[PDB]
Design an enzyme around this catalytic site. Structure first.
Site, mmCIF file in Angstrom:
data_model
loop_
_atom_site.group_PDB
_atom_site.id
_atom_site.type_symbol
_atom_site.label_atom_id
_atom_site.label_comp_id
_atom_site.label_asym_id
_atom_site.label_seq_id
_atom_site.Cartn_x
_atom_site.Cartn_y
_atom_site.Cartn_z
ATOM 1 C CB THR E 1 -18.628 42.823 10.264
ATOM 2 O OG1 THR E 1 -19.209 43.758 10.957
ATOM 3 C CG2 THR E 1 -18.839 41.766 10.143
ATOM 4 C CB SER E 2 -13.930 39.886 11.105
ATOM 5 O OG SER E 2 -13.012 40.384 10.338
#
Ligand SMILES: [Cl-]
Ligand SMILES: [Mg+2]
Ligand SMILES: [Mg+2]
Ligand SMILES: [Mg+2]
Ligand SMILES: [Mg+2]
Lengths: 241, 250, 243, 244, 196, 226, 195, 204, 231
Positions: E1-2
């Site tokens: 994830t970002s």
């Protein structure tokens, strides 16, 4: 004669505690009315603040159960709030479990089932309240479903509750006998509220100021209550024609 | 708090009567008339939609309920007690049968489960009996068509035809004269409408009468195609129009 | 008859007689009041000096809930303590889950539902107290009064106990003569007067005055007891008015 | 509190009787008569349905005679709904015993278990007793053909011939008169029907007002067969014995 | 994830990539990681997809029930309900959640709840596997009281870099703007943000 | 196992292969992996085969009771919510990987679910050992505004990719089409591209080939009368 | 414990069980009786984990004795063996299972037949003409397969049993200190005091 | 150690024209040690036949359990259970022990008394139903059985021809498995007659 | 009358008769006196015997080094309540390293007694207690009633004929409060107070029971020849 104290059958097949709970319903001496428009459902109720020491903003018998569902109660405030808290909890749990907003008629059935249990189980007393649920359902449209201490519930085109319910009921009956339709043929909710207040004035034979009424309105995706100044604007429009 | 009523509220009196069950039957007697008739190729159950107010929408109150695709039920007595029994009956058909055998229960066994629930409210602690009598109609492969009555005591009996509630005594006499073992379903519906007219005071039409049948399989009501062995529910509730059509040939 | 022997039984009127009998115990108790001011609330209570052997200022009656809510009651004192203990648990769990201190209307319902629950069964007795309570939250000052039935409303002024009729009349004058509002310091003075005036219904024994307050400006929205010079000033103001 | 409304179902009278048991027995005395007769070559169970209707579906109806397993059956007198609760419990006990020991449950062991359940409701729990009396007809390889009865008190006894329900005093006198030890099943069938015919409160004894069952070793070689009689078969045995 | 949330002059904006992975396989390239627990209280999810969806559904239920009784909850209150679930079930959860919301009294607020279940109120927050690569960039480029357009550019440029270096991140950049004006959804495609 | 789901103009289609395996052995050559939750809500399952049917029937049973209680036709989001919460509670131990599709009064829907309780939303999805082969076809040929005929074609082409290229998948293609305002049509064995060729030899034995010790009649009938 | 053998002949069942009890390093006892009389015509030998063996055997004994008193009737060997199997089948999925293997030798007075049942700790029951537990069968079954006849006398059964024990004493590494032999027939249970 | 191959054994079932066949070996062992040559693995409840392979204690337990359940079924339903219904009962009963399962491989065979249709079905230890038209296999030599059945089987075989096919399928499969053999039984099942045949086979 | 069958029933005038009947048990009990100065607190208790062969029932119970009470009414109820106080004093010391405040001890006793007045099945406590103690705010005296009402006082008396001792203390209030740093004189005042409640009988060596707690004085009970000094 202990068949009159708990919810067991009398020799006539009657439940006296249930019948006496219906009588507690009129202890507040308040009358309520509910009607359906094209796009909305309106509920109005008398507001009486007899003590000058009271904060009138906290005196209310209309409850916002969920975003879509509203509930007006006829009966003492402790039992009213008891039912309100429970209905709110049931509506929230329903959304969590089944992934969509609890319909008005389904909540009415659920609260009616809970009421039925109090008429059968001895340790629990009935609540001395009549619950009128209103919403604009996404499947059924404008909806009025009413619950009582017996565990009975049904849908309504329109309805009335309180000491003078019969006068209001007959007034509404006569209007729908003329129009021959199941609702108020009106576009805006403002005019449907004006219809509701007018027909209550006609039935009861009394005039209302802005502080004598309490109004709830259900539209698509929200239920809300009107302020005193919103009601005043409604009363002004009624007087000007 | 805690439920401190752990004792029976229904007890034998010196004369051997179970008072609360008798009083529950009295409540059923005050209730609106409902009836059931069994034909060679189907079963019919019917009742009057006694509307409490003309502002009330009586279509939202269902007196005739689907329990399984091939089993239906109607009542006389206390409506709320009936509603919760229908909820319990629908659930028990799944928990104690369909989740075990992968098929819906036969009529007699579902009736048996409903009876058991009604018997327990006659002996368990801190409860009163149910104030209803049920008429349950249904079909299954090995028993064919059947009709059962269930009372507050939990007792149940199979019928060719019967009536319960307000005008049951007169209605049962009317049914005895008309019933034979060669009736087709349409004949039974006709007799049901004739019988029910006697106990109804006011309006008598499709909007004030609730009537359902257990008959042929309805593939149009199944909701999907592709499985030959699944042919659809045998329970069907007649429409307001369908009732009125048969009131002209009355 | 027999409808009044058991709690939660509806009479043929639709009344719960046991709850009505609990009110009689409330009416038998000492006078307590509550005044809603501009930015807060004031609570006051009459303490009957039964004997010289009572240690002055020691038998404290007013109780704090959390740090921003005050509670006073008339009737059976132990029942009131039990209700406050529940209130403190309710306020603790609210702050535990939601971080913010419990709003006064939220707190009012918690007490209301709990008192109402003691009218649902015959295995419990209703509360023999009427409780006046309130404080300051994010939406301002709130004053409530809660009855044995579980019934509560918001108030501008509130009174209960043996001298409630006298007190109510005095409170109604303040509402009429001050539509713009009353200051916190004025409300303390007025509270002292009203208790002294309401003491005519309990004139046999002499009494001790006890006052508390929550104000946004005067106490930073926290509940505090009125002590020392400010208490004496209010006693002097009260004594001057009765003479 | 709740004490006020408690009937106290499990107490003695000053005379040392259990009120509820006595009153439950009074209830059973109004139920249809059920008779059991034990012979050397089998057992007969006969029972009268209570005032029926012409619109009752008889061929699918069962209110008196129930199968507990392949070897044991019961005749019921009292509340039918109460009986079905106990009958299902008894069916389960028989299967528990069969699973545990891989042998069919002896008749007395089953009877003792059901009777103990009835006893419990008279001593503890504060619930009303079951308003049911049973006649147990069964076979096992220890005692052979056996007849028992149990009542709401939980007491059970063995019998050569016995009746429960209505008019048991009259029925027991008639059985005591005509019963002999060397009697056979076909003779016992006739005795049971003749006894019901004389004790009945109805005008005449017909097929539609009866339930009938036999337990015979009249099964091909050393084994036992239960026969729940059909309506037409009850009609035939009524003509054969000369009652209709 | 970002994922990231940034407060600015008019409120707060949440940002996220759209890549979900089981190992090296991208199980979903168009995932919506910006989740609504109340009208103007949203969250960003990182960690186990099952865990964060279960948590967010429970929080949404809690805040719906809060609203019916006590009216609109604060962002601080929403963060507390998230924390209570993450802290008390720390042994059985793998969730890193950023809570962002808009009040009228408090305006834009951001709370970050890392693995342990601790709460940290911040002017902006970054999380997920890709956030490691933009600690330097974000610290150098964040200013308080930015405009809407500046904040959109800050998030777009930041997540662009996180996506560039982190294999676990990718797809479209989703954003949700929370102000007094309402709720606005934004989407930015690869051809746009890759050339930055 | 290969299972896919594809959205189209006025509804949704799901498809699956028909091979079920015990390690490297094919247990059943014509397995039915398309399960019915309700008349117009169908799902396909991969993973532990007992878990996918058990969890489908339990939720399907509770959905039916819910539909009777509310007097409303069941919704896909209800099936989704009930499935994910059940699967999350069991922390992945119930090895059910599902693609849930259907039509309801709200419209047409397509979701996937995974054993741990993650769910996702999509216009096209694939699950199972042959999901990578199927997704390759879906990523090559999917477009917006597909017709019914195009979606059935795409779905079955994606399953074929699984059949031919994944050893875990094989035999036939099953399809189920759920269109708005119509009955759901279950197309069992929609494609049959794996019929076995005729054998070279008949292996019917002469009668009396097998050596026998004892013969006896088994009594399946109940105890007889007389 | 170690070796337990059983053989069903014409009119009786013979059970042989070792006498040794070993606590790891030392042989603590050389006269131990690894058997319990469940009823007048039913005997059960046992072997398995220390403590569990006797605890299980005495528990079964108590239950069968309770049944005998309640009904005034002796259960058949088949009925007893089924009860024992169910207890072990229940035990195997418990928190801590009984690690006990048993042989049940009984004479059915109704059928006038001897019966031998072999049950392991899992609840695996088989009726056999001759049986064993542990490694005992590995040494003895080839002899029993050869010499056994269904019409053997009790004396012939004891002689075939001696040949089995001799083979065990020759090829087994452990010293099991001989065996106690017991016979079950129509007259009940008796011990052969010289073997 | 592996519970499903401690005792050993096999079951196979086949369909024919208006008939079904189910067969099993007779071995029970303790790993390498052969313990019993009379351990039958096929049971019947009315006209429905159930074969069970796997851990022997569970084979015995489940037989006793399904006898229990089908006996209560018959008393309440007033009719014998059918193959289709029984199949669902086996599936339900196995799945209730999802996280502590019976280590078995059941096989159902029978003819529906009302429709006359031949029916067979198989299960994994946890309840999953395999309902094949042609044949079902189970046990420690299931691989071998799959190989025999796949080549020997043809549809619509007459009862006496079906006997030869299933017998040869079992025998030759069992002879390639160390933990199967020591005798065999074959049931030929028609609508109202069932014949049981014990086969002569090598005893090693 | 019809409203005294259980503790869960109010009367029509709002009274709880079961609680009032429990209060009546205290009035039947033997007299006990409590009084305090600023440095010390004293309990004086008249013990009651069954007959001349019997012992005199003990009236004073120690709860901690700094706290204890005297009882009047049902003695077993005093044992239950004093045991609860011992535990609460002990919980405070173990968990918080803190001696339990006398005022807080009164609050705990009130709440315990209240639960028995609002629930079905139970019964009120049938005993009255006089708690003395020395904590961080000096000497204290409490009076407990089984209705739940706990009151802090300079002096008081409970039991039969307690009104005589209570009037004496009300007169002497200004004198005995000033008796600081003189334990013997404070006990003398307590013995003179309890003497105003005696009739026919007088204070003997096995009749009198005295307890004291103060600034540098742990809670100690005096019986037998130890109280002859004060007779
Ligand atoms: Cl419900
Ligand atoms: Mg009740
Ligand atoms: Mg990347
Ligand atoms: Mg072999
Ligand atoms: Mg070999």
């Amino acid at each position: 004669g202990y068949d009159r104290h708990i919810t067991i059958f009398s020799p006539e097949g009657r439940l006296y505690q249930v019948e006496y709970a219906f009588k507690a319903t009129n202890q507040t001496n308040i009358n309520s009315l509910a009607v359906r428009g094209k796009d909305c459902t309106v509920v109005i109720s008398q507001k009486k603040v007899p003590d000058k020491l009271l904060d009138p903003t906290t005196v209310s018998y209309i409850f916002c159960i969920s975003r879509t569902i509203g509930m007006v109660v006829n009966g003492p405030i402790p039992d009213a709030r008891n039912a309100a808290l429970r209905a709110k909890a049931e509506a929230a749990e329903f959304r969590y479990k089944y992934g969509y907003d609890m319909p008005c008629d389904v909540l009415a059935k659920r609260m009616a089932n809970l009421s039925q249990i109090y008429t059968q189980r001895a340790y629990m007393r009935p609540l001395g309240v009549i619950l009128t649920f209103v919403s604009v359902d996404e499947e059924l449209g404008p909806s009025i479903y009413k619950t009582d201490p017996a565990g009975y519930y049904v849908g309504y085109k329109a309805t009335a509750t309180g000491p003078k319910q019969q006068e209001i009921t007959t007034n509404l009956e006569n209007h729908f006998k003329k129009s021959k339709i199941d609702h108020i043929n009106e576009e805006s909710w403002e005019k449907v509220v004006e219809f509701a207040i007018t027909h209550m004035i006609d039935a009861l034979g009394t005039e209302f100021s802005k502080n004598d009424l309490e109004v709830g309105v259900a539209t698509k995706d929200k239920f809300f209550t009107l302020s005193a100044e919103n009601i005043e604007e409604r009363l002004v429009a009624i007087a000007e024609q | 708090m805690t439920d401190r009523y752990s004792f029976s509220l229904t007890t034998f009196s010196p004369s051997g009567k179970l008072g609360q069950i008798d009083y529950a039957l009295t409540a059923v007697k005050q209730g609106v008339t409902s009836l059931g008739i069994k034909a060679t190729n189907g079963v019919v159950i019917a009742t009057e939609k006694k509307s409490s107010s003309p502002l009330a929408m009586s279509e939202t109150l269902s007196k005739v309920s689907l329990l399984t695709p091939d089993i239906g039920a109607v009542y006389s007595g206390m409506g709320p007690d009936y509603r919760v029994l229908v909820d319990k009956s629908r659930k028990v058909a799944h928990t104690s049968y369909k989740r075990i055998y992968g098929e819906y229960p036969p009529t007699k066994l579902l009736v048996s489960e409903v009876a058991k629930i009604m018997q327990e409210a006659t002996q368990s602690g801190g409860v009163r009996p149910f104030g209803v009598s049920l008429l349950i109609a249904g079909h299954d492969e090995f028993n064919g068509f059947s009709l059962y009555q269930v009372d507050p005591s939990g007792s149940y009996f199979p019928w060719k035809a019967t009536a319960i509630g307000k005008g049951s005594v007169a209605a049962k006499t009317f049914l005895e004269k008309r019933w034979n073992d060669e009736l087709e379903l349409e004949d039974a519906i006709h007799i049901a409408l004739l019988t029910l007219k006697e106990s109804v005071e006011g309006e008598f039409n499709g909007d004030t009468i609730e009537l359902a049948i257990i008959g042929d399989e309805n593939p149009d009501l199944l909701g999907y195609t592709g499985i030959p062995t699944d042919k659809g529910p045998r329970f069907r509730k007649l429409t307001s129009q369908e009732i009125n059509d048969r009131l002209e040939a009355l | 008859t027999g409808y009044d022997l058991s709690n939660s039984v509806f009479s043929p009127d639709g009344r719960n007689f046991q709850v009505e009998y609990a009110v009689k115990a409330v009416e038998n108790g000492t006078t307590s009041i509550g005044i809603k001011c501009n930015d807060g609330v004031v609570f006051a209570v009459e303490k009957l000096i039964t004997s010289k052997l009572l240690v002055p200022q020691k038998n404290v009656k007013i109780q704090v809930v959390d740090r921003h809510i005050g509670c006073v009651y008339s009737g059976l004192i132990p029942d009131g303590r039990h209700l406050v203990n529940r209130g403190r648990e309710e306020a603790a769990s609210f702050k535990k889950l939601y971080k913010t201190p419990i709003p006064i209307p939220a707190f009012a319902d918690r007490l209301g539902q709990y008192v109402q629950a003691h009218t649902l069964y015959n295995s419990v007795r209703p509360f023999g107290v009427s409780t006046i309570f309130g404080g300051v939250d994010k939406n301002g000052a709130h004053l409530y009064m809660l009855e044995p039935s579980g019934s509560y409303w918001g108030y501008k002024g509130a009174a209960t106990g043996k001298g409630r009729q006298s007190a109510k009349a005095e409170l109604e004058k303040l509402v009429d003569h001050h539509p713009e509002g009353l200051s916190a310091r004025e409300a303390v003075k007025q509270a002292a007067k009203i208790i002294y005036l309401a003491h005519e219904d309990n004139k046999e024994k002499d009494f001790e005055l006890e006052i508390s307050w929550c104000s946004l400006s005067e106490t930073n929205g926290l509940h505090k007891f009125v002590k020392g010079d400010l208490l004496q000033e209010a006693i002097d103001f009260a004594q001057k008015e009765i003479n | 509190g709740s004490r006020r409304y408690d009937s106290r179902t499990t107490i003695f009278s000053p005379e040392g009787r259990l009120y509820q048991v006595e009153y439950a027995l009074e209830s059973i005395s109004h139920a249809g008569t059920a008779i059991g007769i034990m012979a050397s070559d089998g057992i007969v169970l006969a029972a009268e349905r209570k005032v029926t209707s012409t619109l009752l579906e008889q061929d699918t109806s069962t209110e008196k005679l129930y199968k507990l397993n392949d070897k044991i059956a019961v005749a019921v007198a009292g509340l039918t709904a109460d009986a079905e609760i106990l009958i299902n419990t008894a069916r389960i006990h028989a299967q528990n015993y069969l699973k545990t020991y891989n042998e069919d449950i002896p008749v007395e062991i089953l009877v003792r278990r059901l009777s103990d359940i009835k006893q419990g409701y008279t001593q503890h729990g504060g619930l009303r007793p079951f308003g049911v009396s049973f006649i147990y007809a069964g076979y096992d390889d220890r005692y052979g053909y056996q007849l028992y009865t149990s009542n709401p008190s939980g007491n059970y006894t063995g019998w050569k011939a016995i009746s429960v329900g209505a008019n048991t005093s009259a029925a027991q006198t008639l059985l005591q008169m005509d019963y002999k030890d060397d009697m056979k099943v076909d003779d016992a069938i006739e005795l049971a029907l003749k006894t019901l015919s004389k004790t009945t409160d109805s005008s005449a004894l017909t097929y539609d007002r009866l339930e009938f069952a036999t337990i015979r070793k009249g099964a091909n070689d050393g084994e036992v067969y239960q026969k729940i009689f059909k309506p037409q078969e009850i009609k035939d045995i009524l003509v054969k014995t000369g009652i209709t | 994830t970002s994922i990231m949330a940034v407060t600015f002059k008019d409120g707060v904006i949440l940002g996220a990539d759209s890549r979900t992975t089981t190992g090296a396989y991208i199980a979903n390239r168009v995932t919506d990681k910006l989740t609504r627990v109340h009208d103007k209280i949203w969250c960003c999810r990182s960690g186990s997809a099952a865990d964060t969806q279960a948590i967010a559904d429970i929080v949404q239920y809690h805040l719906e029930l809060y609203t019916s009784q006590y009216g609109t909850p604060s962002t601080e209150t929403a963060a507390s309900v998230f924390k209570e679930l993450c802290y008390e079930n720390k042994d059985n959860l793998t969730a890193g959640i950023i809570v962002a919301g808009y009040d009228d009294k408090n305006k834009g607020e951001v709370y970050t709840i890392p693995l342990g279940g601790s709460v940290h109120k911040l002017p902006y927050a970054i999380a997920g596997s890709g956030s490691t690569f933009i600690y330097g960039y974000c610290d150098k480029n964040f200013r308080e009281n930015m405009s809407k357009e500046e904040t959109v550019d800050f998030i777009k440029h930041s997540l662009s870099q996180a996506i560039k270096w982190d294999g676990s991140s990718g797809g479209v950049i989703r954003m949700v703007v929370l102000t007094a004006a309402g709720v606005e959804r934004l989407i930015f495609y690869p051809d746009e943000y890759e050339q930055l | 196992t290969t299972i896919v789901g594809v959205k189209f103009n006025n509804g949704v289609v799901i498809a699956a292969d028909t091979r079920s395996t015990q390690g490297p052995i094919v247990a059943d050559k014509n397995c039915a992996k398309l399960h019915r939750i309700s008349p117009k809500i169908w799902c396909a399952g991969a993973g532990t085969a007992a878990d996918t049917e058990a969890v489908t029937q339990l939720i399907g049973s509770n959905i039916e009771l819910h539909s009777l209680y509310t007097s409303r036709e069941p919704r896909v989001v209800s099936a989704l919510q009930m499935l994910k919460q059940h699967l999350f509670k069991y922390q992945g131990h119930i090895g059910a990987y599902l693609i849930v599709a259907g039509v309801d009064p709200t419209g047409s829907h397509l979701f996937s679910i995974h054993a741990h309780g993650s769910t996702d939303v999509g216009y096209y999805l694939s699950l199972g050992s042959g999901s990578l082969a199927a997704m390759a076809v879906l990523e090559s040929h999917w477009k917006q505004d597909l017709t019914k005929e195009e979606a059935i074609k795409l779905a079955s082409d994606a399953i074929q990719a699984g059949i031919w290229n994944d050893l875990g998948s094989g035999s036939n293609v099953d399809v189920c089409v759920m269109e708005i305002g119509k009955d759901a049509e279950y197309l069992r064995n929609y494609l049959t591209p794996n019929v076995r060729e005729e054998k070279q030899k008949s292996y019917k034995f002469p009668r009396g080939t097998t050596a026998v010790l004892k013969e006896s009649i088994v009594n399946i009938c109940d105890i007889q009368e007389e | 414990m170690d070796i337990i053998l059983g053989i069903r002949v014409q009119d009786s069942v013979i059970l042989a069980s070792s006498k040794a009890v070993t606590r790891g390093i030392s042989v603590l006892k050389d006269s131990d009786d690894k058997t319990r009389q469940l009823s007048p015509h039913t005997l059960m030998s046992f072997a398995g984990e220390a403590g569990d063996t006797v605890q299980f055997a005495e528990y079964i004994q108590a239950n069968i004795q309770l049944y005998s008193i309640r009904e005034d009737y002796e259960l058949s060997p088949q009925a007893v063996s089924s009860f024992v199997r169910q207890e072990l089948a229940k035990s195997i999925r418990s928190r801590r299972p009984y690690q006990v293997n048993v042989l049940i030798g009984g004479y059915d007075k109704k059928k006038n037949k001897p019966e031998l049942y072999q049950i392991d700790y899992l609840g695996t029951k088989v009726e056999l003409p001759y049986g064993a537990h542990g490694y005992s069968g590995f040494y003895t079954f080839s002899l029993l397969d050869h010499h056994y006849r269904p019409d053997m006398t009790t004396e012939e059964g004891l002689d075939l049993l001696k040949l089995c024990v001799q083979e065990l004493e020759k090829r087994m590494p452990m010293d099991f200190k001989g065996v106690i032999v017991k016979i079950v027939d129509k007259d009940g249970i008796r011990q052969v005091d010289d073997f | 150690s592996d519970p499903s191959s401690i005792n050993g054994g096999i079951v196979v079932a086949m369909t024919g024209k208006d008939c079904v066949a189910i067969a099993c070996d007779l071995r029970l062992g303790s790993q390498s040690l052969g313990v019993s040559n009379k351990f039958e693995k096929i049971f019947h409840y009315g006209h429905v036949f159930l074969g069970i392979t796997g851990l022997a204690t569970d084979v015995t337990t489940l037989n006793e359990m399904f006898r229990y359940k089908t006996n209560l079924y018959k008393l309440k339903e007033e009719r014998a259970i059918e193959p289709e219904t029984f199949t669902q009962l086996v599936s339900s009963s196995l799945y209730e022990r999802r996280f502590g399962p019976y280590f078995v491989g059941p096989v159902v065979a029978g003819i529906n008394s009302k429709s006359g249709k031949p029916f067979i079905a198989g299960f994994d230890l946890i309840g999953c139903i395999d309902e094949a038209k042609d044949f079902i296999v189970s046990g420690t030599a299931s691989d071998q059985l799959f190989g025999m059945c796949e080549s020997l089987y043809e549809p619509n075989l007459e009862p006496e021809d079906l006997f030869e096919t299933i017998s040869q399928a079992l025998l030759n499969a069992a002879d390639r498995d160390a933990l199967s053999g020591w005798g065999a039984v074959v049931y030929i099942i028609k609508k109202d007659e069932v014949v049981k045949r014990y086969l002569k086979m090598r005893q090693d | 009358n019809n409203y005294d069958g259980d503790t869960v029933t109010f009367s029509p005038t709002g009274r709880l008769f079961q609680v009032e009947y429990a209060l009546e048990a205290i009035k039947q009990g033997s007299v006990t006196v409590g009084l305090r100065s600023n440095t010390h607190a004293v309990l004086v208790a008249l013990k009651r015997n069954a007959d001349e062969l019997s012992s005199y029932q003990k009236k004073i119970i120690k709860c901690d080094e700094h706290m204890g009470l005297s009882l009047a009414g049902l003695a077993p109820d005093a044992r239950v309540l004093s045991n609860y106080l011992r535990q609460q004093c002990n919980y405070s010391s173990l968990v918080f390293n803190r001696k339990l405040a006398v005022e807080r001890a009164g609050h705990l006793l009130c709440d315990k007694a209240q639960k028995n007045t609002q629930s079905y099945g139970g019964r009120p406590y049938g005993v009255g207690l006089l708690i003395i103690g020395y904590d961080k705010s000096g000497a204290h005296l409490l009076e407990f009633q089984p209705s739940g009402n706990v009151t802090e006082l300079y002096g008081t008396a409970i039991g039969a004929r307690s009104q005589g001792a209570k009037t004496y203390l009300e007169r002497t209030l200004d004198t005995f409060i000033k008796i600081d740093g003189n334990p013997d004189e404070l006990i003398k005042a307590g013995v003179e107070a309890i003497s105003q409640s005696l009739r026919d009988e007088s204070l003997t060596v096995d009749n009198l029971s005295i307890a004291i707690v103060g600034k540098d004085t742990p809670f100690t009970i005096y019986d037998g020849e130890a109280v002859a000094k004060y007779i």
